[PDB]
Design a protein around this ligand. Structure first.
Ligand SMILES: Cc1cc2nc3c(=O)[nH]c(=O)nc-3n(C[C@H](O)[C@H](O)[C@H](O)COP(=O)(O)O)c2cc1C
Length: 153
């Protein structure tokens, strides 16, 4: 299995999370990290990666941070088949705000609707918890490894 770890950020937290996730996953799956500001659905598909991990912050009206907004709009507009892919979502947000962690929820909805298969839970990192996002992402990445190793029965 090989993975792409894609981040949507404004102030750098999601970037740090993508990097930490990549280092945790690397002994089990080959990984590459990219900013959503420089990735598209077509380039994602072109890579041939079969696990796509998203680290996405929320801003505005529950919108994707950074490059995520245009990336997910291209998915909505073009609706490519993602049935060949597994995905996982690490959301960043802050319960100080309304639309708490809505970007991660929206990503999981859209990706599954196109046939992607989710691995693990959608994380909801909360800045108001005081926990460091990248540390939380590292712990979540171990949960994803456990999920990948877990059978139906
Ligand atoms: C102006 C502003 C609006 C925000 N809006 C939301 C929001 O709607 N929902 C949410 O859960 N977090 C919201 N956040 C919190 C950010 O998603 C959070 O700080 C996150 O860690 C930022 O990640 P980044 O550094 O990758 O941009 C907002 C933050 C700011 C500064």
């Amino acid at each position: 299995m090989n993975a792409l770890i894609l981040y949507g950020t404004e102030t750098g937290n999601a970037e740090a999370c993508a990097t930490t996730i990549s280092q945790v996953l690397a002994d089990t799956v080959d990984t590459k990290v990219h900013d959503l500001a420089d990735m598209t659905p077509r380039a994602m598909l072109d890579s041939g990666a079969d696990l796509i991990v998203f680290a996405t912050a929320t801003y505005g009206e529950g919108e994707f941070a950074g490059g995520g907004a245009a990336f997910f709009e291209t998915l909505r507009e073009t609706k490519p088949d993602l049935s060949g892919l597994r995905f996982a979502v690490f959301g960043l947000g802050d319960s100080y705000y309304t639309t708490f962690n809505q970007a991660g929820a929206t990503a999981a909805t859209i990706l599954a609707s196109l046939g992607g298969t989710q691995v693990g839970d959608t994380a909801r990192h909360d800045t108001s918890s005081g926990d460091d996002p990248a540390a939380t992402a590292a712990e979540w990445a171990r949960e994803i490894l456990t999920a990948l190793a877990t059978p139906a029965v």
